[PDB]
């Protein structure tokens with residue numbers, strides 16, 4: 001069953017300026033280039049998933065408008081299905097103002113989340129789970145997403161072992177409400193930002209420190225930028241892959257999303273956790289030498 | 298003859314994020330609000346001119362596309378005529394990435410001028426000068442704009458004194474090619490940035506220092522932000538108006554454009570240079586207490 005991979009989360013219009021040096025206050029500078037790029041964690045993962053060759057679908061809140069039309073068009077050009085999008089009656093699809101330093105790949109994100117209602121459990125209740133082999137959830141509205149996770153669980157209990165839906169979750173924002181999401185999913189992604197916010201100084205210590213929160217049987221993954229990525233499963237052994245830096249790092253916008261999608265892809269292809277860590281570091285690393293995601297395969 | 302006022306220059310899509318504190322490098326912050334706003338020096342002056350009650354027209358290069366459609370729609374909502382726009386066959390209308398500090402009104406502009414061809418003399422040669430009582434030119438492609446200025450001059454020589462077209466020019470960028478524009482126009486606007494670039498420390502010393510470059514009979518104007526604005530005409534007397542700060546300064550984006558348009562409006566209404574300086578400081582000052590230009594009248 002090579003069904004689709006469903007990613008649930010944010011879609012964002014990223015307005016991107018590429019500069020030599022980060023601008024100072026009240027200054028006026030001319031940019032190297034500018035672009036609009038579809039963004040949002042779950043949305044970027046769909047881009048990378050479809051570039052890796054996997055049929056995938058995005059599910060997130062969008063509002064009808066010019067921004068949405070651009071985003072929907074871009075989704076469809078990547079081959080990312082949007083039939084599960086939760087269209088709202090009023091509002092604006094979120095957007096960000098992004099500055100990318102070209103000399104080191106740093107990225108400044110000024111985000112506008114638009115009081116747009118999040119994907120609700122009632123929205124997710126309508127999804128036909130039989131279309132997906134893997135469902136990835138970007139931690140967002142935790143109380144509602146738990147019910148989605150519970151719905152997937154009840155479905156899985158009634159399926160034969162080979163037709164159970166694999167589940168991954170990302171806890172990327174250091175917000176207390178999201179931490180309960182650690183206890184769901186077969187694969188849990190914890191951000192370096194969340195690890196540090198929680199007092200850890202390395203992926204390894206974060207993995208050892210946090211593993212008692214995950215569902216028994218789950219794999220906890222913590223990427224650490226230039227120091228590579230680490231994972232920890234039920235057998236208690238810490239796994240690690242080094243980073244694979246490109247010659248010049250020019251754009252780290254969405255680099256964590258590339259890692260996440262690559263790990264999801266690798267595991268969904270039957271690879272082992274060690275293999276998935278290495279592939280994730282490789283694809284994310286070479287994204288960092290590119291503007292955007294084209295050229296990552 | 299209360300004909301139109303024509304402003305020649307840039308139109309820009311300003312993508313604006315309003316923040317508490319200016320973001321640091323590689324950080325991720327959430328904005329207070331975001332908006333798109335039509336921008337560009339000549340374009341912003343048209344906005345303020347139409348808010349002051351004057352029929353006006355914009356002339357600048359635009360490329361057909363979604364950005365242009367937004368800009369044209371916004372022009373027409375302000376009542377700014379766009380029939381003289383120089384549509385190009387290929388390219389993108391310029392846009393900027395703007396961050397506005399809400400606690401002091403500072404503005405960071407990251408601009409993308411799009412290799413879009415500038416309004417040429419051949420474009421301007423087609424304009425029906427009999428429709429305009431005043432023509433303002435944003436210094437840009439100086440060699441071509443001089444020929445426009447020369448065309449207006451030849452027209453004026455053949456008109457009765459009361460039907461001569463008044464001309465103003467802005468020299469806002471510290472670029473050597475633009476300085477020849479000092480010798481044209483009845484009113485010359487020199488920016489604080491250009492004054493400083495040229496070694497001056499105050500409007501007054503800039504006016505005294507630069508006046509020998511202007512056409513005999515012209516008035517030289519130099520605005521200096523919180524220190525108000527100064528002017529110098531042929532009689533040799535230095536005129537000055539203080540600033541009129543709002544209670545809270547929240548948005549200085551386009552504040553010089555508001556001053557320019559207000560001086561043009563005031564002089565075109567027959568007021569004296571002293572009056573035009575005060576009005577310009579008043580309207581620009583109270584723009585600085587507002588986001589955008591609505592509410593400036």
Ligand SMILES: COc1ccc2ccc(=O)oc2c1CC=C(C)C
Nearest residue numbers: 223225228244245255256259284285
């Ligand atoms: C945030 O993600 C980053 C950030 C900076 C770099 C720099 C070199 C590199 O090779 O990869 C980077 C990554 C992706 C690697 C991982 C493990 C996610």
Ligand SMILES: COc1ccc2ccc(=O)oc2c1CC=C(C)C
Nearest residue numbers: 520522525541542552553556581582
């Ligand atoms: C650049 O323009 C600025 C910048 C900052 C302020 C702050 C207070 C104020 O009252 O006006 C300002 C202006 C406009 C005044 C002039 C003379 C152009």
Ligand SMILES: OC[C@H]1O[C@](O)(CO)[C@@H](O)[C@@H]1O
Nearest residue numbers: 012014039040041096254257
């Ligand atoms: O927080 C949302 C921001 O983060 C990103 O998804 C990067 O992974 C950007 O595309 C978006 O602007």
Ligand SMILES: OC[C@H]1O[C@](O)(CO)[C@@H](O)[C@@H]1O
Nearest residue numbers: 309311336337338393551554
């Ligand atoms: O340099 C162009 C920039 O300057 C402004 O015109 C401000 O006067 C902005 O509207 C535009 O982004």
